[PDB]
Write a protein that binds this ligand. Structure first.
Ligand SMILES: CC(C)c1cnn2c(NCc3ccccc3-n3cccn3)nc(O[C@H]3CCCNC3)nc12
Lengths: 289, 26
C-alpha cells in the first residue's frame, strides 16, 4: 500500500500494469493490478505461489502482493523492455554474441526453473523481459505449472503441445526457446501459423515432417493429425549465417522427440556456448531506442 | 570471455514424460 503510481503501461486479458515507486526506498517496480465472485484471480494466485518458491537472476522476482476484496496487485521488479521489441526493431543488429547471450540467460533461468520442477509454458520474446542492466528474466508465470507429478502461444508452441500432449516435460519450453532463437536469427517469427493446423504445417514444411525414428509414439498424442512428407529446408539454408555449433544447438532444440530434445542443462553444455566468441556481457546487449 | 558451464504411457513418452522424472522428483 506504500507504492505510488507513476506511469501506465498497458492492459491485457488478465490485468493492467503500472510503473510504480516504493516510497520507502525510491525503487522502480511494476504493479500488475488484476482487472466473478470466485475470489482472487487464479492467475494472480498461480503467479504468487510459484514466484514465492523461486529465486534466480533469470526469473522475474515477485516483490509484493497487496489489495482489497477479490482485487489484488502484484509488485514485480520493473523490466525496461522485452525480446519482442528487440527482434522487431530493425535499427538493432543481433550479432552472434548477442544471440548467444540471450540464449544463455534464457537457458540458465530455464535450468533453474526446471530443476525446481516448474514449466514456464508461455515462453516467447514478449515474455522474456530485459532490464536496464541486460539481465533477461522469464516473466508472466500465469501459465507456469509444476511438473513431475503424473498452452504456449501458437507460433512458439511445441509440436507435442500442438498435437495435444496433456503430459509433457521441459521440451515444451525448450522448443519455444528454439523458436525464439530462430526469431532472433531471422528478425521475424520463425513459424507464424494461423490455426493449430497451419502451425504444424509450417513446422513440417520448414524442419521436415518427423517420422517414427525421429519421434517415436508421435501418433499416440491425442490431437495427432498426420501431414505430408515435407523434406524440410536444410538448417544451414534457413540460418545461412549460423555456424556449425549454432546449427547443432538449433538441431538439438528443434528435435521433434521431446525426450531427445536437449534439456536446458545439456543445451548449456553444448560447445556452441563455450565456443568463440563468448556471450556478450548483459550490460553490452542492444537497447531498443 | 568464453562461457563455461557450472552445475509412463506412450502418450507421456511422446510428450516428454519418461517416468524417471517422477522417480527423481519423489
Ligand atoms: C511481468 C511484470 C508485470 C513486468 C515487469 N516490468 N513490466 C513491464 N515493463 C515495461 C515494458 C516491458 C516490456 C515491453 C514494453 C514495456 N513498456 C514500457 C513502456 C510501455 N511499455 N511491462 C509489462 O507489461 C507491459 C507489456 C504489455 C502489457 N502492458 C505493459 N510487464 C512488466
Amino acid at each position: 500500500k506504500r507504492y505510488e503510481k507513476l506511469d501506465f503501461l498497458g492492459e491485457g486479458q488478465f490485468a493492467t500494469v503500472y510503473k510504480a515507486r516504493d516510497k520507502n526506498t525510491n525503487q522502480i517496480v511494476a504493479i500488475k493490478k488484476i482487472k466473478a465472485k470466485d475470489g482472487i484471480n487464479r492467475t494472480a494466485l498461480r503467479e504468487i505461489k510459484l514466484l514465492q518458491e523461486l529465486s534466480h537472476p533469470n526469473i522475474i522476482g515477485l516483490l509484493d502482493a497487496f489489495g482489497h476484496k477479490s482485487n489484488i496487485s502484484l509488485v514485480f521488479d520493473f523490466m525496461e523492455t522485452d525480446l519482442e521489441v528487440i527482434i522487431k526493431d530493425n535499427s538493432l543488429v543481433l550479432t552472434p554474441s548477442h544471440i548467444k547471450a540471450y540464449m544463455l540467460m534464457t537457458l540458465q533461468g530455464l535450468e533453474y526453473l526446471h530443476q525446481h520442477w516448474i514449466l514456464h509454458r508461455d515462453l516467447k520474446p514478449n515474455n522474456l523481459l530485459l532490464d536496464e542492466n541486460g539481465v533477461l528474466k522469464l516473466a508472466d508465470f500465469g501459465l507456469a505449472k509444476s511438473f513431475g507429478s503424473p498452452v504456449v502461444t501458437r507460433w512458439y508452441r511445441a509440436p507435442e503441445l500442438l498435437f495435444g500432449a496433456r503430459m509433457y516435460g521441459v521440451g515444451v519450453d525448450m522448443w519455444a526457446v528454439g523458436c525464439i532463437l530462430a526469431e532472433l536469427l531471422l528478425r521475424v517469427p520463425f513459424l507464424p501459423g494461423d490455426s493449430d493446423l497451419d502451425q504444424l504445417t509450417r513446422i513440417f514444411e520448414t524442419l521436415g515432417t518427423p517420422t517414427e525414428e525421429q519421434w517415436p509414439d508421435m501418433c499416440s498424442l491425442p490431437d495427432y493429425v498426420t501431414f505430408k512428407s515435407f523434406p524440410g529446408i536444410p538448417l544451414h539454408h534457413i540460418f545461412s549465417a549460423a555456424g556449425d555449433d549454432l546449427l547443432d544447438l538449433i538441431q538439438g532444440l528443434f528435435l521433434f522427440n521431446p525426450c531427445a530434445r536437449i534439456t536446458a542443462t545439456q543445451a548449456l553444455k553444448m560447445k556452441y556456448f563455450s565456443n568463440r566468441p563468448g556471450p556478450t556481457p548483459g550490460c553490452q546487449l542492444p537497447r531498443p531506442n | 570471455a568464453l562461457y563455461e558451464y557450472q552445475p509412463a504411457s506412450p502418450q507421456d513418452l511422446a510428450g516428454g514424460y519418461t517416468s524417471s522424472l517422477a522417480c527423481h522428483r519423489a
